[PDB]
């Protein structure tokens, strides 16, 4: 017989607010999940407040995030996020090591470390946003489920990764609200 | 006001062979010079034989070694070097203090200690492979000259560094040939 296990951590909204408020630089890497939940709006609002509070907050977009090329740039633009804070993977990937917090919102395949850590993965070698290199990662999705490529993501079990489970819009709505009360 | 002195040491092939034969752990840090001279091939054969003699031989690749992204990884692969012995700087730098011998092959800026020793240097604070922390270093290049950054490299003058001057391919071809014949 055989068996293998994995351990992940889940945090609550209060803990997430703590991490956000303590962080000075933040990168948001959105994916298909944000698109499905139509979460562009609450996250745009949140980003505006954090920026006005003096934090460095930028979006890092994978060339193939979502389901259509440039789909995330369009939705973020529709939410009124400034174009100067929406960067492409190639221009921002190098900032992860120097980043305090990364908010992974409805992204999975585009931030999957198996692309570099598993030689026998089907996405091995494929370029991804290296979010795990930052100080703290908060993953916002409904579960530890798979993405389009149907493969497990090692970042879910890394020490510096915390899962904030729930629909992307609901979670961003709540965060945006609790930050407005600060 | 002051004037320090520095001495470099030039060695010949047989001397390099003795250093290799005597080393249990070897790390190779290749750079632009290896590519230019097309020395991937002889070095690949050399590593195979050494590994076969029981020696732990690995490659340490700097993120910006060569002149294109992943250039050294691609050329070494093509020459048949096992992906499992090619490591990125960040995953191997901590082992230099515990390494017997380092073969710097056509690398300079990526192994320049001035990044850590000269606060006024144009490369100050930039990460480099800390080859000089190992027991013995052998540098293979044509001269005591500069690399792309156009700055002198202090490791050529450290007591544990030996210069094995000449075109990288001509040199690697000879080393592989002598190693074979033993
Ligand atoms: N960009 C393009 O043009 C294009 C074209 C063809 C294929 N693709 C492929 O699509 C993938 C895109 O990468 P990605 O990171 O964006 O995608 P994914 O890897 O498709 O990520 C989707 C993630 O969002 C979550 N999600 C779905 N609904 C959600 C919701 N309502 N609230 C919160 N989370 C939700 C899912 O997890 P839960 O189920 O746990 O919530 C899922 O794992 C790539 O594999 C790419 O190659 C892209
Ligand atoms: N990787 C990228 O995509 C990229 C892009 C833009 C800039 N760069 C820059 O390029 C540099 C790369 O670092 P590195 O250590 O590989 O480079 P270097 O510092 O460029 O090293 C080249 C060394 O190899 C030697 N060389 C040239 N031909 C040789 C030959 N035939 N045989 C033996 N030696 C030879 C040269 O010395 P001799 O003349 O004494 O032999 C030289 O000092 C970095 O400063 C990096 O920032 C990289």
UniProtKB/Swiss-Prot annotation, chains A, B:
Residues 1-182 are mitochondrial matrix. The modification N6-succinyllysine is found at residue 178. Disulfide bonds: none annotated. NADP(+) binds at residues 32, 64-69, 106-110, 125-126, 141-148, 167-168. Homodimer. The transhydrogenation between NADH and NADP is coupled to respiration and ATP hydrolysis and functions as a proton pump across the membrane. May play a role in reactive oxygen species (ROS) detoxification in the adrenal gland. This is NAD(P) transhydrogenase, mitochondrial. It comes from Homo sapiens (Human). The gene is NNT.
């Amino acid at each position: 017989p055989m068996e293998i296990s994995g351990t992940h951590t889940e945090i609550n909204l209060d803990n997430a607010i703590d991490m956000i408020r303590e962080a000075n630089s933040i990168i948001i890497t959105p994916g298909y999940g944000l698109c499905a939940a139509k979460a562009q709006y609450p996250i745009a609002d949140l980003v505006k407040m954090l920026t006005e509070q003096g934090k460095k907050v930028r979006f890092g977009i994978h060339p193939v995030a979502g389901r259509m090329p440039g789909q995330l740039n369009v939705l973020l633009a529709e939410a009124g996020v400034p174009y100067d804070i929406v960067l492409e993977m190639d221009e921002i990937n190098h900032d992860f090591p120097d980043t305090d917090l990364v908010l992974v919102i409805g992204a999975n395949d585009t931030v999957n470390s198996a692309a570099q850590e598993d030689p026998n993965s089907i996405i091995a070698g494929m370029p991804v946003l290296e979010v795990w290199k930052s100080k703290q990662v908060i993953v916002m999705k409904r579960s530890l489920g798979v993405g389009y490529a149907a493969v497990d993501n090692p970042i879910f079990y890394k020490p510096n990764t915390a899962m904030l489970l729930g629909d992307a819009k609901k979670t961003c709505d709540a965060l945006q609200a609790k930050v407005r009360e600060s």
